[PDB]
Symmetry: C3
Subunit: 90 residues, 3 copies
């Protein structure tokens, strides 16, 4: 069983975030121009996808974590990770 | 056993599209700033990836749906989903 | 089981698109730059693939994350061939 990843990036430095789903847990590795480091994101999930956008210089990230038929959205809007309004009927 | 997702976003509202492959079928959930809703995208596939770009304010989306070794590209260019020219090998 | 897994990225307004496919332990690349699909130079081992890219004016930079077991290897395109990146899962 191999891990499954998702990646996003922004700006010109750039900043990169790589999410890895491994044995039901999703963790995050970060690059902001110095070295790679472990990010704050840690949520359950067997599958992960991500998207992000800038509002000026501020990054907004949405991570979609799935276990079984349930996908939970996690939001970064500059202060911390919060559960989003995303729902689906899988 | 878990569903597999792909996500893309555009602009600063933003608009978000999340594709979910579940039991051989891909469906789409949409956000344009005022609640999640079910999109028009419905195509076969066990795996999904997506990318998108803007030309001015017009969004263009490409969804890559795979079953076995066959990947089919689906195109949104502002006027419905159409099958794209993408081919792989074999 | 038996289905390939893909990752895609795009840039500009032509556009250019790159689609990476992990099939039976090998990752390959298909390219579009407005004039037909062609096979790219990317060829690395892996069971899973993800990608991200960013433009610096007209210059594309791509990072492909190829995984086998718990090891993810980053591959870099900065205009001059694919090179192994500094990404690691732990310090
Ligand atoms: C500043 O915090 C770091 O960057 C944010 C954009 C998030 O990726 C977070 O999980 C990470 O720890
Ligand atoms: C403001 O709402 C938050 O951000 C939107 C862009 C969506 O991700 C939504 O599900 C989330 O709750
Ligand atoms: C207006 O239509 C909605 O947005 C488009 C960009 C597509 O995602 C389509 O499937 C969806 O129903
Ligand atoms: C113009 O051609 C259409 O759009 C391009 C950006 C590609 O996705 C191609 O496969 C598709 O048929
Ligand atoms: C010009 O070379 C083509 O485009 C580059 C941006 C890379 O995707 C490379 O693997 C591909 O063969
Ligand atoms: C300059 O460093 C290269 O590019 C950065 C944006 C990262 O992808 C890093 O792992 C890689 O080695």
């Amino acid at each position: 069983g191999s891990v499954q990843t998702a990646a996003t990036s922004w700006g010109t430095v750039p900043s990169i975030r790589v999410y890895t789903a491994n044995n039901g847990k999703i963790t995050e590795r970060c690059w902001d121009g110095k070295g790679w480091y472990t990010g704050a994101f840690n949520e359950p999930g067997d599958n992960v996808s991500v998207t992000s956008w800038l509002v000026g210089s501020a990054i907004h990230i949405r991570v979609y974590a799935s276990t079984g038929t349930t996908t939970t959205e996690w939001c970064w809007d500059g202060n911390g990770w919060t559960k989003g309004a995303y729902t689906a009927t899988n």
